[PDB]
Amino acid sequence: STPITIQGKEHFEGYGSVDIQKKPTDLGVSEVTRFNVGNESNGLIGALQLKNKIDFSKDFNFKVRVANNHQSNTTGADGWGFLFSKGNAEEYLTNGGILGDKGLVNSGGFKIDTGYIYTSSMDKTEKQAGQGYRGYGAFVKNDSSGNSQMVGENIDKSKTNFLNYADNSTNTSDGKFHGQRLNDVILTYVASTGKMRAEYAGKTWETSITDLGLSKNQAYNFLITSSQRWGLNQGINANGWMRTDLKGSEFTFTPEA
Ligand SMILES: [Ca+2]
C-alpha cells in the first residue's frame, strides 16, 4: 500500500470521440483532451479510462480540470460523467454512462449535466428545460438493470443541484465561476467513512459509495466520460466540445495490487 499522485493524458486510454486540441486560445493552456468531435447519426460518445484500477479500501483525491461548451442545452454535450465501474470504456461506448436515463450496470459516479434531453424524466424534475446554459450537478447510480437514478445530496447552504454550466462573460478573470472556462472538479473519497464528495462551480455534493452501489473491498475502473446527443438519432447540429486539461489535473489514490 503506497498512494501515488499522477498527472497527464499518458495515464488515460482514450476511446471513441476524443482527440487532442493543441493551443486552445479560449482556455489558456498548451492543449486539452476534447470530447464530442465530428458528426454521427446516433451522436458522439467518448471516454478516458484511467490505466490503473482504484482500490476502494483506500482514500482518493482527484482534481479534474473541465471546461463546458458555450452552447445551448440541446445542440451541445450531454455533460461530464465521472464514473466508477467494473465495466470498461468499450462497454461504455455501446451502453452509455450516467448522463441520461440508462447506462452501464452496478456503476455510479458524479455528473455535470449540460444537455437537456427531452426523453429524460430526471432533466424535467431538475428544471433543466429553458434558455440560459441550464445544468445541474449530482451523483448518479446505475442499478443492476442499468436504470440511472440521482443519489446523495447537494450540501451547500443553497441546497439545489442547479448550476449555470456556461455564461456570456467577457471578464473571465473577475474571480467568479465561468463554466465555459476550465474549473476544478474535486472528487474526494475517505475509505474509513465511505463518503465521496464532489466540489464544482463553488457548490458541494456528497454520497456514500454504498448509495452508488460500490464496495470498499473492490478495485474499480475510473472513466472520464462525455457524450453529445448520444442515442437521440438527431445527429450532431453544432460544436459540443467538452474539454479537460489532464496535465493540470491531479489524481492521488492507491492502485489495485
Ligand atoms: Ca440532462
Side-chain angles (χ1 to χ4, degrees):
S1 259
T2 261
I4 67 170
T5 292
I6 61 180
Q7 301 198 88
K9 63 203 180 138
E10 318 86 58
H11 295 292
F12 297 95
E13 280 255 8
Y15 299 99
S17 204
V18 179
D19 69 356
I20 295 297
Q21 171 181 18
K22 298 168 183 169
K23 329 188 291 142
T25 54
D26 62 330
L27 287 188
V29 293
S30 60
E31 63 169 6
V32 286
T33 302
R34 172 171 50 191
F35 291 77
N36 307 314
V37 289
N39 186 11
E40 301 288 9
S41 55
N42 207 19
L44 295 179
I45 183 153
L48 308 160
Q49 186 152 333
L50 173 71
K51 288 165 173 194
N52 356 16
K53 275 213 191 359
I54 310 266
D55 188 342
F56 270 46
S57 66
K58 308 317 190 161
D59 306 336
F60 67 74
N61 181 131
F62 296 170
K63 178 196 70 170
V64 187
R65 300 282 274 157
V66 302
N68 308 138
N69 47 199
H70 186 240
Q71 188 60 71
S72 52
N73 75 6
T74 80
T75 57
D78 309 332
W80 296 106
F82 309 105
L83 177 60
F84 303 93
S85 186
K86 285 308 193 169
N88 65 18
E90 289 290 3
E91 305 180 43
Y92 161 77
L93 287 194
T94 83
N95 285 28
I98 54 160
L99 281 176
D101 276 9
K102 176 172 209 49
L104 280 177
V105 303
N106 302 318
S107 299
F110 186 70
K111 74 173 175 168
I112 306 173
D113 191 329
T114 63
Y116 179 73
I117 275 100
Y118 66 86
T119 53
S120 170
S121 98
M122 208 192 275
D123 283 0
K124 138 135 215 163
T125 50
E126 292 303 329
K127 289 279 220 281
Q128 177 167 48
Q131 312 74 47
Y133 312 101
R134 301 182 61 74
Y136 61 103
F139 289 97
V140 178
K141 159 185 182 155
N142 295 350
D143 60 12
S144 67
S145 303
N147 301 138
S148 305
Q149 260 263 315
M150 169 184 307
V151 303
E153 262 185 16
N154 184 74
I155 61 152
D156 304 318
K157 273 85 207 210
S158 56
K159 272 310 276 209
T160 179
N161 302 301
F162 178 82
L163 60 92
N164 303 101
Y165 64 77
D167 66 28
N168 285 346
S169 176
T170 57
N171 294 128
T172 62
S173 289
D174 68 354
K176 309 174 27 157
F177 185 67
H178 305 297
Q180 76 282 359
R181 308 285 296 192
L182 291 168
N183 290 288
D184 290 338
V185 177
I186 304 303
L187 307 165
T188 57
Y189 167 66
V190 198
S192 58
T193 89
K195 290 307 222 159
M196 191 168 313
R197 182 176 283 211
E199 307 171 76
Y200 181 64
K203 300 186 61 30
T204 291
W205 297 255
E206 195 180 18
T207 194
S208 63
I209 57 159
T210 310
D211 271 348
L212 291 173
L214 307 169
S215 148
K216 52 171 204 162
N217 70 346
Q218 298 294 324
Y220 293 101
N221 300 136
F222 170 68
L223 305 276
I224 301 170
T225 71
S226 200
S227 67
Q228 181 187 9
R229 315 310 292 159
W230 185 77
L232 296 164
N233 296 277
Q234 298 152 26
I236 301 293
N237 255 299
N239 168 311
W241 302 344
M242 295 291 270
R243 291 183 287 173
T244 184
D245 162 20
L246 298 181
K247 211 181 26 162
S249 297
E250 204 171 296
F251 309 83
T252 296
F253 63 108
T254 309
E256 176 192 46

